[PDB]
Write a protein that binds this ligand. Sequence first.
Ligand SMILES: OC[C@H]1O[C@H](OC[C@H]2O[C@H](O)[C@H](O)[C@@H](O)[C@@H]2O)[C@H](O)[C@@H](O)[C@@H]1O
Ligand SMILES: OC[C@H]1O[C@H](OC[C@H]2O[C@H](O)[C@H](O)[C@@H](O)[C@@H]2O)[C@H](O)[C@@H](O)[C@@H]1O
Ligand SMILES: [Cl-]
Ligand SMILES: [Zn+2]
Ligand SMILES: [Zn+2]
Lengths: 304, 306
Amino acid sequence: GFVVSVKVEEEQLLFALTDLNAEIIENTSIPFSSEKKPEEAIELIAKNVKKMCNHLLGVGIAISGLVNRKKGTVIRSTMLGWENVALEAMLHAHFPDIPVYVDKNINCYTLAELWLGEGKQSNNFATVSVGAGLGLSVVINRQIYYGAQGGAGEFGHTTIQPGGYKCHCGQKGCLEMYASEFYFRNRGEELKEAYPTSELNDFHFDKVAKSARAGDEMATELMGKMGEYLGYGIRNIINTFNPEKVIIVGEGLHHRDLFLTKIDEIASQNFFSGAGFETEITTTSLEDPAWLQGAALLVIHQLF
Amino acid sequence: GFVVSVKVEEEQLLFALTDLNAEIIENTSIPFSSEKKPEEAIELIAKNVKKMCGNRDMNHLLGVGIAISGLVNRKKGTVIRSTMLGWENVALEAMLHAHFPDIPVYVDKNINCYTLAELWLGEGKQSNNFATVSVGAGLGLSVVINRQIYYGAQGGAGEFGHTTIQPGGYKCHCGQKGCLEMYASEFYFRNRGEELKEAYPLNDFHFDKVAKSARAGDEMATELMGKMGEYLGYGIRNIINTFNPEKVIIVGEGLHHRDLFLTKIDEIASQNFFSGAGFETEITTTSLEDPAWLQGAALLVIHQLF
Ligand SMILES: OC[C@H]1O[C@H](OC[C@H]2O[C@H](O)[C@H](O)[C@@H](O)[C@@H]2O)[C@H](O)[C@@H](O)[C@@H]1O
Ligand SMILES: OC[C@H]1O[C@H](OC[C@H]2O[C@H](O)[C@H](O)[C@@H](O)[C@@H]2O)[C@H](O)[C@@H](O)[C@@H]1O
Ligand SMILES: [Cl-]
Ligand SMILES: [Zn+2]
Ligand SMILES: [Zn+2]
């Protein structure tokens, strides 16, 4: 009795085999750029699901973008450049009598928080992810809020700087262009000429954090500003939702020492704290594999 | 039976007498700036509640509903924080009960009251997840999820006017810098208008006055009004990407001058995460009018009594 879950990131596919309590039995990571390559990615997924396995009760998939959870399709992921991808149908060519379920990445994480994490107690909280992009999932009554057609929570594509950086979504000035890994490239390209002896020219989160800790001037400017914008974003979430608490999650937390304080400084100055009512902003006690545990719970709740 | 409703604005107090369908029977408005004067406001409210009742059996007054800006504790009827008014911990319901100790008094945020009117009387009656956004003196939001207003943890949800649209921008009455309200409401006209004086050699920055000058062809007022509409567009875009509402209902006194900014909203807000995939979100103006703030505050009472 087992479930297989998948997280489709932009530069790697993650897999796990879990039991019926979403406890991980095995997990792996396959380097692959899925950008504009859904068919090839899905063949790799099928191959790697088969590799991990009769008593496969389902496959759960966490992915970026607008998903139709009813049909198992990826309507629009501008993170991946995927347009109307029939993910469930395509995997069912390989695994005919195995349920496939798809949901937005951060919604899957939030299922994990609800069942295993600091969303055990709470009934109204928000989950914000930091890393490659910026994600949001809001829980209202221990239920994820999906909005009219499952698209709620594209908080990364709220405008934080009108007229600012061009986003992958087609808009200018999206929060994700300032309050995620994308900022390091957007701003780092502009700063090259001013900082010609910077170590830094790979703008992945890890590399930027490494250089910032090493005292590189450009890297610390990038990391400092990204934290400020993330602070604005979390403040916005607070003033908008009045959540009981905000739970920060995501791979960016490997470098939390470089931005959490900045987030707290900004986000704790909010509409309700002006009256003396503080909103708790806390980091998840779950780790990176909870994206996969959550995608598994996607299947498990469909069963029971 | 009847109820009396009140809307506490920043420069006037509005009143209505209402039957139990929220139909307005009487109304009045007193020009009074309640800015840092809660005690005087309550005396005026008490006076005008009585005036609304007229010669009626006061025994038939079923309750009083009050629409107001800011963070309200809707259980105790306190105004915890209205930075629009400069009020903090005003025990509005208790102060009123001192005058009317034997009738219910209910308090809620202004745009929540309007949204009750949309739910019962308007374009919200036929929807289950929609967002209501008010334009005028400030920028309000109420979101309905399953035909219920979403209040969040302590009733504070929807301070969307105090999301940051321009980091480092205009100082807001809430204490933050760069709030959406400083760009997508009447406040923008003062904020930006003061900066544009030297560029355009209009001195009253109220919404009505700026609208008048913009229609008359005043370059400054036209520039103010266009940009305000752009910012309101971004605000509504953000609402859409955040909530994926079935629809957005625009409401408020700012709509008296809708022809000066509504097309700018649609241009910006229609470009959103879901419309990129061919799914349009309807953005429409309410068919209700200004008195629905008062009808909503009456519904606040009625639908808590019955
Ligand atoms: O925050 C870490 C997280 O970033 C992405 O997911 C968040 C977010 O990214 C874009 O805004 C999409 O439009 C949203 O639908 C996504 O929720 C990465 O995809 C994810 O792998 C990473 O953990
Ligand atoms: O939009 C017209 C409306 O503006 C104000 O109410 C909206 C909003 O103002 C601030 O952001 C407050 O902090 C919020 O609690 C309010 O909902 C005016 O107070 C109102 O009279 C007017 O109709
Ligand atoms: Cl600020
Ligand atoms: Zn974007
Ligand atoms: Zn503000």
